[PDB]
């Protein structure tokens, strides 16, 4: 529809889907046919519609010539090609009329209602900065810039540190722990050892897990009643062995005047309240917690924490290796069953590290903000600092969002005018959790029968189901949050809700509905490869939260027996199924309230 103007016109105005005139060119010629059949061609029974559509030309054919479904032949009747030339002119007042309801809406939000659009959000990145062997200390202030490359069709991306760290030579040589799994026997894991050059393996180690590098402490398999043999060396005097897993960090090439700054990359289910201890020359551990200023919230989230290494901390000490300085960390893991109640996951840990945020957010085009920036990208600063050896990012670019497009800006303000930042109804509780929290895949309401039986039930229980990106419990199909941040979603929604509304969010218990189906495949495929491949797409559609990087799609509690049977049929490798045998722990099974169905295939 008039591609010469509508490129220029669509770029200025948002031009949404709705049009004031859906009048198509085929629809217009039927309107002009009923008009002309009234006008009398003079002194004759035939009318003017016989003139304008004369010889083998119907308005369906003239619309085909106009939209070029038919190639335009050289001979057309002149009063018809006069008529098709008019409809080419009338595309211009129509196209300026369809562009106006998109401009009426934007006038309403920005001029009268005063609403603004969100700007671009800068993203920060973990940045580890190692030094050379030539100096010990090097200071760099707030606002020094690191960079890698350039955005397409624009400027270079600079990253600046938010806080002025001072770098020192050194590294994390040793990371070891003691865990207390059983009475009178304790195991001694050594995942990270620089002196044997063994690294932190496999991108992440379960803290206090079965590493199989452990050796049992035979000095402590029977408790002492040798020079007082304890783990990791001889102790001077009696030291307690409490029921708390604790990990020890081995620091190297750091002087007691200097400070140390780590960035922990963590996914922890529940936060353990930690206390930190350091070695001394008397071989007694002292408290370090006055010196620690942590932003990792006692190892809850990823974050930087810098510690000035305390004075009179000793390199040479008993009960530990003598070459390295040591820091102790006592983990108080909260008591809970399952893999939810276990330790953090520890993607990694880097020394001499500090985060770095994006510098100028307006100049960078929208292509960079779409994806996180790739890992191991920034390898150099902007200004060449000669004593620096290398920077590196092991992980890269969490956070940061696009500047708002006019489609998504309209959806954002349409939400603010619907609920108005108060969660008063069932629908308003569903969206207000979904926009703020990124961990939420979906929320489903508590059903149809529940709200009508109601013998004065005050308590309402929203059942949240999260994505596979953010789940604390180690189950892919069954994602669970920890109850502390699950309670914090209720405390956010208690302010928006009525004071009489006691609202709290929970994870729903998962019903398992089994199916035992027989199915005949293609003539030239093995069925065991055919069973396994068909099972993956069936696992995907009815558990969309299970597969990583999925947009939240709204999906009901009910699974239909026949819509299941049709969904099996659209696989390219299927030919025909025989039976399904729906087996709830044969008809359609509908999910009872506060329950979510998971399919099982055995």
């Amino acid at each position: 529809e008039l591609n010469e103007l509508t490129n220029k016109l669509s770029n200025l105005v948002p031009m949404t889907d709705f049009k004031l005139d859906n009048r198509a060119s085929l629809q217009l010629l039927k309107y002009i046919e009923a008009y002309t059949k009234i006008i009398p061609f003079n002194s004759g029974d035939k009318y003017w519609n016989d003139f304008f559509f004369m010889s083998g030309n119907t308005p369906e054919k003239l619309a085909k010539l106009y939209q070029k479904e038919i190639e335009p032949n050289g001979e057309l009747l002149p009063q018809q090609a006069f008529l098709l030339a008019v409809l080419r002119l009338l595309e211009t007042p129509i196209s300026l009329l369809n562009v106006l309801p998109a401009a009426h809406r934007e006038l309403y939000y920005r001029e009268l209602l005063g609403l603004s659009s969100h700007a671009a959000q800068p993203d920060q990145v973990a940045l580890s900065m190692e030094l050379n062997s030539t100096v010990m200390e090097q200071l760099l202030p707030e606002g020094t810039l690191f960079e890698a490359g350039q955005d397409e069709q624009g400027n270079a991306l600079q990253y600046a540190l938010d806080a002025s760290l001072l770098a020192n030579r050194g590294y994390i040589s040793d990371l070891r722990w003691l865990r207390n799994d059983g009475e009178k026997q304790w195991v001694t894991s050594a995942p990270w050892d620089l002196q044997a050059q063994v690294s932190l393996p496999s991108d992440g180690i379960r803290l206090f897990g079965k590493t199989n590098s452990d050796q049992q402490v035979f000095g402590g398999v029977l408790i002492t009643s040798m020079y007082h043999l304890t783990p990791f060396g001889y102790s001077s005097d009696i030291e307690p062995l409490e029921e708390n897993p604790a990990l020890y960090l081995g620091f190297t090439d750091v002087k007691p005047g200097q400070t140390l700054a780590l960035y922990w990359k963590l996914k922890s289910p529940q936060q353990p309240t930690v206390s930190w201890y350091y070695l001394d020359q008397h071989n007694q551990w002292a408290e370090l917690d006055s010196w620690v200023s942590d932003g990792t919230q006692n190892l809850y989230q990823d974050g930087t924490w810098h510690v000035e290494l305390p004075v009179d901390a000793s390199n040479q000490a008993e009960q530990m290796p003598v070459g390295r300085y040591w820091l102790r960390a006592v983990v108080e893991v909260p008591a809970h069953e399952g893999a939810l109640g276990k330790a953090p996951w520890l993607y990694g840990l880097i020394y001499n590290a500090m985060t770095a945020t994006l510098v100028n957010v307006d100049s960078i085009s929208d292509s960079h903000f779409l994806t996180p920036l790739p890992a191991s990208s920034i390898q150099r600063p902007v200004e060449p600092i000669i004593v620096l050896a290398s920077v590196n990012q092991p992980w890269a670019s969490w956070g940061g969002r696009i500047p708002e497009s006019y489609s998504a800006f309209f959806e954002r303000i349409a939400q603010n005018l619907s609920h108005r930042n108060r969660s008063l109804t069932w629908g308003n509780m569903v969206t207000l959790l979904k926009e703020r929290y990124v961990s939420i895949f979906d929320v489903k309401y508590p059903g149809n029968d529940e709200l009508t039986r109601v013998p004065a039930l005050e308590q309402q229980q929203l059942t949240v189901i999260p994505a596979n990106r953010y789940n604390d419990s180690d189950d892919s199909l069954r994602p669970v949050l920890n109850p502390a941040r699950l309670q914090e979603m209720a405390d956010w929604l208690q302010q928006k809700d009525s004071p009489w509304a006691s609202i709290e969010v929970r994870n729903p218990e998962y019903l398992d509905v089994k199916i035992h189906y027989e199915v005949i495949f293609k003539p030239d495929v093995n069925e065991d490869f055919g069973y396994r491949q068909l099972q993956q797409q069936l696992c995907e559609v009815y558990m969309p939260w299970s597969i990583d990087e999925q947009r939240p799609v709204v999906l009901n509690n009910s699974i239909n027996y026949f819509q299941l049977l049709a969904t099996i049929q659209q696989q390219p490798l299927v030919e025909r199924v025989t039976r399904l045998t729906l087996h709830r722990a044969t008809a359609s099974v509908e999910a009872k309230d506060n329950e979510v169905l998971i399919l099982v295939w055995e």
Partner: protein, 780 residues
């Protein structure tokens, strides 16, 4: 400014080059001469100038297109005054926090009478609304113990003005709480607070280089920063001051609609359930701030705390804990009673020892005087209305040798030409109407079937009208095909509702599509006031979520009319909390209320039928369980006591139930209506029903349509309105015939016209449900 970018495109020279290319491709063999002489191009040059005329009217600025003609205007500008940011961004007072924002607003000049409109502070310096204590929560017998869920108390800390006149502030707050009464909650008890004068010895030392005339500036300053710390006063200021600040328009209009000022930060008022400590170690820097003050020398009290036993907490000298009910009044009748008299509640020390003082009136001139500010509604004013509607014919601009403005039918070639310009005139006349329809096409207060347009292009005196005067009645009537295109108007309401996040209702089968559409029209016009009052059961007006329920179902009704007219409605939303009362020496004597449950015997149903019925009764309670175990046939004579324990679950209204426990046997068939109903006590299902349970009475004529399957319909009816209800708020529905609905329809309106009384109109409604009433006073 759409004109400057499209200016090269909506042009005669560029539209003509578009038109020649359609001729040169399609009719290059039959029409090979396109020079400037022939009649074919001059007709096209007339039309391609008329399109350039028509497309120029689209590029006028949007404030001038959307304004209507000055003869027909809705009162304020382009968008109606209900759609301003003061009503579109602000939501209702539901939180305890914006209860505090609303109660802090109330002011003496907002009162409709009294005090000569000039005196007065705001009525309350701080309020605290909280749920009532759990031990006394409207617990009631008549059977066993039942506590009411959902009514709170509020503690009112009044100001210095309203403690002068308590009775004036009482009538204004009792007006305000009915207008802000929510869906299942109400105020039960109002607490007024009592002042305690907090003497507050503090010895100010003044700077070296103060003037002697600046010292009344000091006494006013040390008073004002002492008040705003001890007495938590909310700060209000104008909207345009917030527009100077960095925060957006979304942040300003966040709370409820405040007529006086905006309160973006709360004073964080402490709860009045417990006694309250007042820590004054933070005070000294607020006192050190002012220019002449160099330090303070003392901070104590001279034994004026013992009257209510204010104890200093554990070790610190600065803190004091006022006992349960009281609030500080630190210097009552402040300057003339305390500060001016040189008794020393506040001793100023200046230049070592000179120790100067001041009178009462001298510091009030240097005192900051507040300003009472009122916030007018925000509107977009009209632009200049432009005459885009008038249409000038293309047959005028042709050369006069073609004879279109000539005398009619002087030559015979005039009439076949003048009918050839007619179809290309009506296509251009549709384009001139639809720009003039744009204030009508995009208004939020829509009222019409009528879309794109059907008006005749020629004025009635014109010569162009005289040519087609034989078939102008026939052409205008096929121009009235635009009423057949009125489905398109339902696609704009789906677009205009999408500004406020909601789609239009789906089209049903029981529409009555004429009456369906006006429900969909009034849903758009009143849309911001519906979401502003989502839970406002105001005692006279129709419930503002009853409208929002009916629109989402889509079912027709007059409840979107400008006046409610509560006699004839589709359904009715009643609350059980509205039926409960809280309240010459011993003649009042309130003995009992809500005597016992019961019904009247016409016919019995156990299995759920289409109404799941008996007239002047209800099958409303949902028991499977045990028998109805009494009958009360003839109490005018003997044989009392022997009332029968009937069958467990039997449905008898017709003789298809032909099967027959029973003891003390009965007479029971079809003749005596004098028997009554009951329930046996060994089901033991006495539940709390009055707490948060809305009852919606529905017509059963919607089920009367064939093929209904009332259970399968009921899965769809509660499917949509589930989102419409609050989560805590709970719904049981009871649907009856046409006659029992109309008996309810009279009794609801007399109930609402009186203003919801607890009299005989409410007890009839209480009889109409399961819950049972005491009708014994009005027996006949």
């Amino acid at each position: 400014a759409l004109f400057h970018s499209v200016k090269d495109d909506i042009h005669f020279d560029t539209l003509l080059e578009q038109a020649h290319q359609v001729i040169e491709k399609q009719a290059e063999k039959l029409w090979s001469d396109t020079a400037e002489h022939d009649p074919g191009i001059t007709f096209l040059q007339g039309i391609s100038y008329g399109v350039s005329d028509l497309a120029y009217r689209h590029t006028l600025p949007l404030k001038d297109l959307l304004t209507p003609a000055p003869d027909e205007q809705q009162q304020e500008g382009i968008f109606p005054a209900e759609f301003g940011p003061h009503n579109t961004l602000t939501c209702g007072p539901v939180t305890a926090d914006d209860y505090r924002k609303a109660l802090l607003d109330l002011h003496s000049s907002d009162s409709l009478d009294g005090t000569q409109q000039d005196e007065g502070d705001f009525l309350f310096r701080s309020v605290q609304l909280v749920r009532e204590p759990e031990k006394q929560r409207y617990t009631y017998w008549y059977a066993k113990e039942f506590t009411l869920r959902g009514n709170y108390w509020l503690y009112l800390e009044p100001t210095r003005w309203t403690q002068g006149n308590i009775a004036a502030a009482t009538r204004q707050l009792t007006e305000f709480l009915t207008k802000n009464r929510n869906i299942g909650e109400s105020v039960s008890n109002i607490i007024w607070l009592q002042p305690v004068d907090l003497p507050l010895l503090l010895d100010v030392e003044l700077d070296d280089d103060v003037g002697a005339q600046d010292v009344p500036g000091i006494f006013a300053a040390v008073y004002s920063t002492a008040e705003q710390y001890l007495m938590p006063g909310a700060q209000r200021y104008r909207t345009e001051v917030l527009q100077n600040a960095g925060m957006s328009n979304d942040q300003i209009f966040e709370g409820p609609l405040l007529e006086h000022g905006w309160i973006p930060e709360l004073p964080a008022a402490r709860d009045y359930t417990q006694r309250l400590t007042l820590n004054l170690s933070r005070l000294v820097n607020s006192l050190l701030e002012i220019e002449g003050i160099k330090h303070v020398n003392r901070l104590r009290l001279d034994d004026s705390f013992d009257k209510t036993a204010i104890e200093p907490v554990k070790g610190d000298t600065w803190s004091w804990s006022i006992k349960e009910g009281y609030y500080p009044r630190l210097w009552g009748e402040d300057p003339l009673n305390q500060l001016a008299q040189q008794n020393g509640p506040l001793r100023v020390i200046a230049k070592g020892g000179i120790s100067v003082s001041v009178s009462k009136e001298q510091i009030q001139a240097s005192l900051p005087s507040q300003s009472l500010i009122q916030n007018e509604p925000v509107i977009l004013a009209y632009g200049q209305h432009r005459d885009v509607g008038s249409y000038y014919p293309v047959s005028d601009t042709l050369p006069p040798c073609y004879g279109l403005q000539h005398s009619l039918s002087e030559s015979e070639h005039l009439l076949p030409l003048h009918q050839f310009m007619l179809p290309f005139e009506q296509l251009l006349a549709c384009g001139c109407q639809q720009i003039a329809m744009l204030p009508r096409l995009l208004a939020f207060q829509r009222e019409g079937y009528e879309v794109w347009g059907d008006q005749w292009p020629f004025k009635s005196g014109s010569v162009n009208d005289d040519a087609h005067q034989d078939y102008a009645p026939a052409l205008k009537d096929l121009l009235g095909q635009i009423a057949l295109d009125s489905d398109h108007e339902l696609d704009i309401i789906n677009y205009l509702l999408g500004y406020f996040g909601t789609q239009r209702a789906p089209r049903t089968f029981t529409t009555q599509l004429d009456d369906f559409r006006a429900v969909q029209q009034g849903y758009l016009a009143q849309q911001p006031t519906l979401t502003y009052h989502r839970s406002n059961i105001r005692i006279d007006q129709v419930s503002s979520l009853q409208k929002r329920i009916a629109a989402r179902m889509g079912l027709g009704g007059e409840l979107f009319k400008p006046q409610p007219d509560l006699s004839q409605l589709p359904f009715y939303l009643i609350e059980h909390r509205a039926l409960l009362p809280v309240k010459k020496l011993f003649w009042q004597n309130s003995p009992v209320w809500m005597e016992d449950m019961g019904y009247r015997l016409a016919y019995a149903s156990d299995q759920s039928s289409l109404p799941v019925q008996r007239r002047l009764t209800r099958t409303v309670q949902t028991p499977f369980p045990p028998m109805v175990v009494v009958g009360s046939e003839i109490t005018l004579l003997k044989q009392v006591g022997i009332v029968n324990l009937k069958k467990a679950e039997s449905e008898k209204l017709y003789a298809k139930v032909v099967s027959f426990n029973s003891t003390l046997a009965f007479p029971t068939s079809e003749e005596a209506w004098r028997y009554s109903w009951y329930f046996s006590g060994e089901k033991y299902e006495r539940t709390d029903r009055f707490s948060f349970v809305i009852s919606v009475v529905v017509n059963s004529d919607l089920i009367k349509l064939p093929g209904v399957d009332p259970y399968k319909l009921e899965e769809w009816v509660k499917e949509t309105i589930l989102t419409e209800f609050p989560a805590h708020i709970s719904m049981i529905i009871h649907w009856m015939d046409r006659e029992a609905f109309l008996n309810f329809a009279n009794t609801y309106q007399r109930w609402q016209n009186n203003g919801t009384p607890l009299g005989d109109a409410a007890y009839s409604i209480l009889e109409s449900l399961t819950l049972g009433k005491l009708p014994s006073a009005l027996k006949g």
